[PDB]
Amino acid sequence: HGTRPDLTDQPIPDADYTWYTDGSSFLQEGQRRAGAAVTTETEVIWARALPAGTSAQRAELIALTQALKMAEGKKLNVYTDSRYAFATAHVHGEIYRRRGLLTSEGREIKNKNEILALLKALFLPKRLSIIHCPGHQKGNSAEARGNRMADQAAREAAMKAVLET
Template identity: 60%
Template sequence: MTVLVSHTMSAVLEAKGGHWLSPQRFLKYQAILVEQDDVEIVVTNIVNPASFLSGSMGEPVIHDCLETIEATYSSRPDLKDTPLEDAETWFTDGSSYVVSGRRHAGYAVTTSREVIESGPLPTNTSAQKAEIIALIRALELAKGKEINIYTDSRYAFGWFMLTEPSGRKEDC
């Protein structure tokens, strides 16, 4: 089978896959896309999927996929991977669970000693959305402060790094 792609998949997967995929999904996609003897990945500059049906491969792609991804999804300059000195430290958490067939959801923004804000969320709120809402609330409450905010949710962290959060919960 020949798979036409607009990027060098193996390079993108190996260099950037860990940023967006769990280790399990990364290995699954790597096994499916890269390690199969009966699958050939061919880079093409055709971006309209309907054009794949014509069988024309087009001219080679003239861009560096990893460079493009880095430029597009680079970390925001206002975010650091080391804690700020002399800044407050906050933690966020969101949860969603089912008891007796009924879903409950909530979020919290805390320090190591006190709850800054917590509250219930609508019953249709997923655990991932609750984590994002907690992170958004922490950002709203911390506006104008120098602060370190920690989340235990890789999903919320990834969502935040790949978007420009506006505080609109419907974007989750």
């Protein structure tokens, strides 16, 4: 009946998982390729190539949603460099849903199905923080490294799918 009341935008100290997500989308070999990833600072938890023509923004929602599903029952800090996915998760998604805009034939809202899946996935972690950090950071901080890891993994997945066919 609504969205997740305890969803926070700052890291929680006691988290089981601190994960970084990224979606990427680019033209490779005459086609729009996309990838989505979930990583720690140092290791890839999950990464996938997504369907041809997937946008960066859709990929970012898909990565975030996957982090939520994987962290079911656990305390999760997840980072995203997408203002779009951050805002969708925290604010826009639930408004669009309550207005009936997600299940409508209106194509005025992009990524309707991913947003609905994200909204459902928000309830899975025991505790949840979805944190925005600027991407493509030159910083040496953990978050800068986690985001570069996630960007790398997402891009690697999309590219690997291309050359594996």
